Each structure stands twice: as C-alpha cells, then as structure tokens.
Write a protein that binds this ligand. Structure first.
Ligand SMILES: Nc1ncnc2c1ncn2[C@@H]1O[C@H](COP(=O)(O)OP(=O)(O)CP(=O)(O)O)[C@@H](O)[C@H]1O
Ligand SMILES: [Mg+2]
Length: 333
C-alpha cells in the first residue's frame, strides 16, 4: 500500500496569542518539527519527522517562508496528477481551532493567497484546456457539503433544509442521499460555486459569529476522462474522485466525527476492527482512510506557548497517520 502522506504547517501568531505575549515553541529544520514545553522547560523538546514540515511562521518576504504555492505544488499537485492517472484522492486539513486549516485549504482570494482547493481546481481546468489529443474529452462534476453535529447540509443548494441522509449503497459504498452534483466546464464557474458554498456554512455566535469551529466542509470533484479511438468505437472511461476536506477544530452529537476520526487513525496505524460507521465523517471517508485512495493530511499548528497541549496532540495524531497505508499493471510499449 501507498502510505498516507503527512505535512504539518505552523502559522504566524494570531491576535489572541499576541495579546498574551506568546512566545514561539515550534522549530523546524528539514522535515523535522520540534516542540518545546513552556511549562516544563526542563525537559528535552519533542521532535517529529514528516513528509513536509512547513515553516510559515514569518511572512513571504522571508526566504524560508512556506507559501500557498509551495504547499500546493508539493502535495496538491501530486494528488491531481494521481487523479489524472485514474486514482481516487483525498486531502484533509486537521488541527486545533484557529491553527490554520481553512487558510491552507481555501486561503483568501487575493494576493496569491488562494489555498489548495482553488489552486487545484485552476490547475485541473488548465490541464484539461491544454489538451491537444482530440481523442480525449472530459467531464467535471462538483459537490460541496458541510457536516455539523453529524448533520449533513448541501452547500450548493442552501435552498433545501433537508438534512441529507448518509446511506450505504448495498454494493457501491457510502453516499449522501440527494446531495447535488453539478457539471462545471470552467474554473470561473467552479470558483463561483465554491464562493457561494463558502457563504452557506454554519456560523457560531460563540466564534463571534464567524464560521462555526465545529463544522466540517467536504469538497468533492468527480473527474471523468473519456478516451475515444476510431477503431472498434468504444470509448473507455476513467473516473477519479477528488475529496478535499477542511475539518472542524480538533479542540447526533457535536464532536463525534472528530473523536471518531482520531480512533480510526489510531486503529489503522496500529493494525499495520475500525469504527468507520461510528460517525458520518469517517463513514463517508472510509475508502480514503485505509481504502482504495491516495491520501494526504496537512496538520495545522499554532506556534504559541499557550497552545502546547493541543499542538502536541495534533503532532502525535499526524505522526500516527503517517503510519497508515491504503490499499490501491500495464504493458511495455
Ligand atoms: N500560513 C499562514 N500565513 C499567514 N497567515 C495564516 C497562515 N495560516 C493561517 N493564517 C491566518 O491565521 C488565522 C486563523 O487561520 P484560519 O482561520 O484559516 O484557521 P482555522 O481554519 O484552523 C479556524 P477553525 O478551526 O475555527 O475552522 C487567519 O487570520 C489566517 O489568515
Ligand atoms: Mg477554518
């Protein structure tokens, strides 16, 4: 099996940390991330090694700053190329509330501050429009959903209050019943759906009416490749499912999916039964976590001393995911 690739990324201090005069307890070198314990400075700092340790604590003027472009060119680009090979792929952002999950996955729409999802979509349509072999034609379908307190809402159709039911097809696996699946033929169109979708996510008074720290957003693309050949006249089809996930803060019930995800990751790392069905998230993502898919985790980290316990926990869960291996033959030309 192909190992689930893992990257961790530390962001600059935020308003909260600055108001408390937080010092940085995170260091990076190569693919290694080290964390210092602010309360017990007498211990030896704990180090963790990953596929990538992104230092984004400073600002783009730094030669060592890990940009949106590097984060995408490393893992995003790799997954898209796998989609083109015909493999199902998944990228999920994990981490404590405010560590930088949405920035990494969505980013902002200016200043080349766009995250993994916008860059991958753009890259996808660019590659498709660069095609010169008329025997190839493409189809791109998108779906966008939110999972909040186990409830699933269609973000591309906030015009229906149905809490869509997650089901298990008798033969083809889990799916969200009646979740809208829209055909898109340009990056501009997909971006427009992404934008309105982002506008439909649940907010929380508790988060100063900002998007609720407890909702999960799953962005799916169904990429179909059709290859003709004037001959026998059969068109062959290659279908890849791209799942881009932005999880709720790691710190019918509020934290079921996240706690269950932790258990699934731990169990998989150990095994190499798994409670996939214990939550809607782990259920829908069953094949991406141990199944037929190329998967990657990007763990967001706060650099502040005040978030030590939470950051250590994220690093430890990212270390375990690194141990997961999914289960995913041509002729010499
Ligand atoms: N690599 C980076 N470089 C510069 N700023 C970053 C950054 N990563 C995150 N930020 C900033 O840090 C703040 C918090 O990040 P963000 O809102 O994306 O976190 P998050 O999605 O983990 C919160 P929640 O758990 O509630 O969903 C934002 O103001 C964001 O722009
Ligand atoms: Mg977020």
């Amino acid at each position: 099996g192909a190992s689930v690739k893992v990257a961790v990324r530390v962001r600059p201090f935020n308003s909260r940390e600055m108001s408390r005069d937080s010092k940085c307890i995170i260091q990076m070198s190569g693919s290694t991330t080290t964390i210092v314990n602010p309360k017990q400075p007498k211990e030896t700092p704990k180090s963790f090694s990953f596929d990538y340790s992104y230092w984004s604590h400073t600002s783009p003027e730094d030669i060592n700053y890990a940009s949106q472009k590097q984060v995408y060119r490393d893992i995003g680009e790799e997954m898209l190329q796998h989609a083109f090979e015909g493999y199902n792929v998944c990228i999920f952002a994990y981490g404590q509330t405010g560590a930088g999950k949405s920035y990494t996955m969505m980013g902002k729409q200016e200043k080349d501050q766009q995250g993994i999802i916008p860059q991958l979509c753009e890259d996808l349509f660019s590659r498709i429009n660069d095609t010169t072999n008329d025997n190839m034609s493409y189809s791109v379908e998108v779906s966008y959903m939110e999972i909040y307190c186990e409830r699933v809402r269609d973000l591309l159709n906030p015009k229906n209050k149905g809490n869509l039911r997650v089901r298990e097809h008798p033969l083809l696996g889990p799916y969200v019943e009646d979740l809208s699946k829209l055909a898109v033929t340009s990056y501009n169109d997909i971006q427009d759906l992404m934008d309105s979708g982002n506008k439909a996510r649940t907010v929380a008074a508790t988060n100063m009416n900002e998007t609720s720290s407890r909702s999960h957003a799953v962005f799916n693309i169904i990429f179909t490749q059709k290859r003709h050949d004037a001959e026998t006249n059969i068109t062959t089809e290659k279908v890849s499912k791209i799942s881009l996930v932005d999880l709720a803060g790691s710190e019918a019930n509020i934290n079921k999916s996240l706690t269950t995800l932790g258990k699934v990751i731990s169990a998989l790392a150990e095994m190499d039964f798994i409670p996939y069905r214990d939550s809607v998230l782990t259920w829908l993502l069953r094949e991406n976590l141990g199944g037929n898919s190329r998967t990657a985790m990007v763990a967001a980290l706060s650099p502040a001393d005040i978030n030590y316990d939470e950051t250590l926990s994220t690093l430890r869960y990212a270390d375990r995911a690194k141990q997961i291996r999914n289960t995913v033959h041509h002729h010499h030309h």
